Design a protein around this ligand. Structure first.
Ligand SMILES: [K+]
Ligand SMILES: [K+]
Ligand SMILES: [K+]
Ligand SMILES: [K+]
Ligand SMILES: [K+]
Ligand SMILES: [K+]
Lengths: 334, 334, 334, 334
């Protein structure tokens, strides 16, 4: 009991040696409780024997020596080291920190088919129809603006919205906490996909509410794991995502002004002002190269060359970070 | 014999210590059979001595302690650790699991030249002619549609098909299991490369059977290891491959609608409907930028800028996974 | 005292053994000073006991054996090994080398708000206005060249420069070493952003001083960490950065000459000389593909194909080095 | 002497134990020669003591046990393990294998200035003029074809060739082995840069010898390390380099035929034949997108979309291998 008396721990032939005050620091563990560890004592050698994994005990003993630092060694498998922590009984408060450091009736029945579709057969069949109603609604939306086009795009627009409403209503009543119902951004999409039609019953407003009829494409996120992974990626990459927008903003203003002063004293110049040369810089840095406007002078072609070179660089800098973020959520979701 | 009696195993000076019940778990092995291991016993120290590799034995002893877990340590070479498993005689059922976890007359003679061309000299010379008959058949197919063009493209089309038939026939008779003949997708290609001509002896059909005269290019897979590696890559990447198609599908419908509502109240607008703006989104996200259609309004250029930015991102996310899959099959095929 | 007498050091059960002349090499350390280490001596075993980390001591003892080589083992955490060096008292001259090898009143008050804006609340509020004066100055600069345009772009140009001057003046007087004031390239930008206007109070000069009114965009580097990281990246990548320019220079002259001699005997040729075909090679290698000029002959299309293939290769060679350099400064700045 | 007698080797407290027949296998080494190792024997413990590196000896002892396998451990530094091999005296034949497995008067004076320019000051000054004569020769070559142009491009063409000849002549006489003079591909370039002019003192020949006046750009490889690294990269990447050309060849014929049969029954079709649609596939897969020809039909735009998608994939597969090959030669040349 905190007395500098020395204790020898033998792990499958690997000899460990520490003070009793070090093990008495955590009395709830195996080596810390004199009653739990005595089952492993060897009175012929004055040591405790364990017929278990050897590379793991380095961190187990150091967990006592450091006072709580539980770090898996770089050569010990994750499943093996985690099973050793449960044997020596380090505790759930210590096991949780190891996982954090490692990176880790009638109402309930109708709630399963309209939320967890893998719960049963008929629960997943509804997910098929809930997808067909999205694809048909997307198809009908694009075929409205066709130059060719009772009103045959109102039978479908209203048949695609009786599902969008009847399905949204059940999820609002079969839900437990109505106050935490709006935290899930996946149901605000279900609302923004019913706001336009139900409010259509100043020209700027009728146009924008027609735009909000394009967010329905996000309703596929409920039935697509890939869109979910994409959402978590951008949400965790806002720094390098906005960093790309900022590096473009500097490159646009820089190279739009550079091509303007090199293509300003020309009758055949296509750069009348700096803002007009903005789109040229964006399509040149992104290597899109529409061809709707291209420099003609010597200095204009020099700026155009450096605009394409600096474009592929300033874009490829924050891309691998976003790609690595995506591969994390994608490989983890298995 | 399962009796808690302790056993000391000395590996080139590294001392290991376990119970006899642990080694008696696998009596067919070296340390498990009392007759096999006694040749290594030292009665002066009461231990078994082995003058072999030291870093490997950590996993060898743990294979007994865990009950079958055979995992090579991260610092032991693959060839060295595999040669240790054969010494201690863990077994073929255990060696196979280690390889799985590590990622690993007259009829027969004519079958070698027309299947395994590296079997001999004349067997590989036929592979040269079997390639020249593919290149000439591909050349003749493209020169048919030339605006310039008994019928001189029937002498070659039929001379290139007497090989395609005579060679396909021998592979059908010199083959053992005729029932498993169609499992190899490499011979269905040999059939789809004879279906059109032999069936040409409703306008929609004559056109499509003319298309099926383009799958002959896949007959090069028999003589090209690179095409084989490409086939295994796509076959193992269907998830991220289709995930790219889906992320494009969302980006197309999203940005085609965005540019349409920004380029709809314009006499000089080139976006009459959403479907017409589909191709613009694909060539902009892929940075192809044909220039056949480009926005003119302010909001149209804003959507065009974000369409090129979101294009290089949503494409570069599943690409490294496909590239890594390709490097696996390519480096392994050595 | 340099006498070959042997010393046994026991680290938590791991036995180490060395000569006394090896530890007496560094008398200022723990194991080197007989008075410091005697507190850990065990007269029953004739050894020094330490109840500390075991994987770290390999390098600690080798620091004595090699004569100063202090290299952290590949399996020991950086924070753990650094805390061991301070226990054994290797010294600050040795700790500094370990960090290098690891990769690591009234005047003062007004100097905080105009240099270290995170010092207080009002110090950071000025950084907001110091950014708004940059954005408005950039906006006003681009709206000058608009084809539409007492003089309303002089009220803003002079209101944006009273801040650019009043703020630059305080940083010159609240600065300690006026001689080392110009070493910081971030203040030469503050000067080049006041040189044009204050000197406007040979046509080639009035034009270039109008260009120098575009370097103001760099004044955002004071309030943007991302621009700072970009500056350090290019400054540390000048080799592979200029290596890209050189590989392009070879590819331009190579493929411009190749397309010229293939598109010289043509009435409809768009390549009258080698220099005119320079811009075509740059936009083709960078995959920009404006379309302002494209080959027509067979050999011209062959050169164009190889120009696009060799373009994506010669560009993607020095890019990952620049990307890796960027990820270093970006992840380190946390 | 091959007698199973056991030998204990103590490395700084780490105990090793082997048979004498194992060490007697290599009598020329330290532990193998009884006269060399006796200087380290301890008659009080019957063991050989060494006050040296501990992680290295695992492979040193296994070099005897395996019979010649000398593999550095994954945790031992390269410089430390190499210095241990020289202490135990394993031999030069064994040290060379370790390096291979690790990846590793008047005539002589004039030969230094014209081959090894870093030998002295005046030797490197000539390299500056030898570069200026290349840049001027390249500049003069491109300014010949200018539409504006005793003959002022013969004074420079001949002044740039008196250096190209006088410098080539000295390297041929100040060279030792004239038979191995043509093995260095860097001097065949010096010959192909003198072949045209000296042979100009059938129209197809005068044109091609005018082309061979473009290989002079390769004379910069003598004064540019980057071009040397690029040469070694392509020379070691011919597999994945030609693999890219082959994957393009399949994609060209595949997608050129696909767009043709979808754009053949159209008065406004721009694809009259398969070969004419070749260039469209190359510029679409490489995302160049000139815009000189673009599909119009529905199926043509479908093929165009898949041609751009399959383009960025089939190109990005063998690129990282070429990039990794380049980073090897580039980082090694330091
Ligand atoms: K392009
Ligand atoms: K274009
Ligand atoms: K591009
Ligand atoms: K383009
Ligand atoms: K165009
Ligand atoms: K055009």
């Amino acid at each position: 009991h905190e007395s500098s008396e020395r204790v020898v721990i033998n792990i499958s032939g690997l000899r460990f040696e520490t003070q009793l005050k070090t093990l008495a620091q955590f009395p709830e563990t195996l080596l810390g409780d004199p009653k739990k560890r005595m089952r492993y004592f060897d009175p012929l050698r004055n040591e405790y024997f364990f017929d278990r994994n050897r590379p793991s005990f380095d961190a187990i003993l150091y967990y006592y020596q450091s006072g709580g630092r539980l770090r898996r060694p770089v050569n010990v498998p994750l499943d093996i080291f985690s099973e050793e922590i449960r044997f020596y009984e380090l505790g759930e408060e210590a096991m949780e920190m190891f996982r954090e450091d490692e990176g880790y009736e009638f109402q309930r029945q109708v709630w399963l088919l309209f939320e967890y579709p893998e719960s049963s057969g008929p629960a997943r069949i509804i997910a098929i129809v809930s997808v067909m109603v999205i694809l048909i609604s997307i198809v009908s939306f694009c075929l409205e603006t066709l130059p060719i086009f009772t009103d045959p795009f109102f039978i479908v627009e209203t048949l695609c919205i009786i599902w969008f409403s009847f399905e949204f209503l059940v999820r609002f009543f079969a839900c437990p906490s109505k106050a935490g119902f709006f935290t899930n951004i996946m149901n605000i999409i279900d609302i923004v996909a019913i706001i336009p039609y139900y409010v259509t019953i100043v020209r700027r407003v009728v146009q924008i509410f027609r735009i909000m009829r394009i967010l329905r494409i996000f309703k596929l996120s409920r039935h697509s794991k890939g869109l979910q992974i994409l959402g978590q990626t951008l949400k965790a990459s806002m720094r390098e995502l906005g960093l790309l927008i900022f590096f473009l903003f500097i490159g646009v203003i820089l190279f739009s002004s550079a091509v303007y002063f090199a293509e300003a004293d020309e009758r055949d110049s296509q750069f009348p002002s700096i803002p007009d040369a903005f789109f040229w810089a964006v399509v040149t840095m992104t290597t899109v190269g529409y061809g709707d406007m291209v420099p003609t002078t010597i200095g204009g072609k020099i700026v155009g060359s450096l605009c394409a070179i600096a474009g592929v660089l300033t874009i490829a800098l924050p891309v691998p970070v976003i790609v690595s973020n995506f591969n994390y959520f994608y490989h983890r979701e298995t």
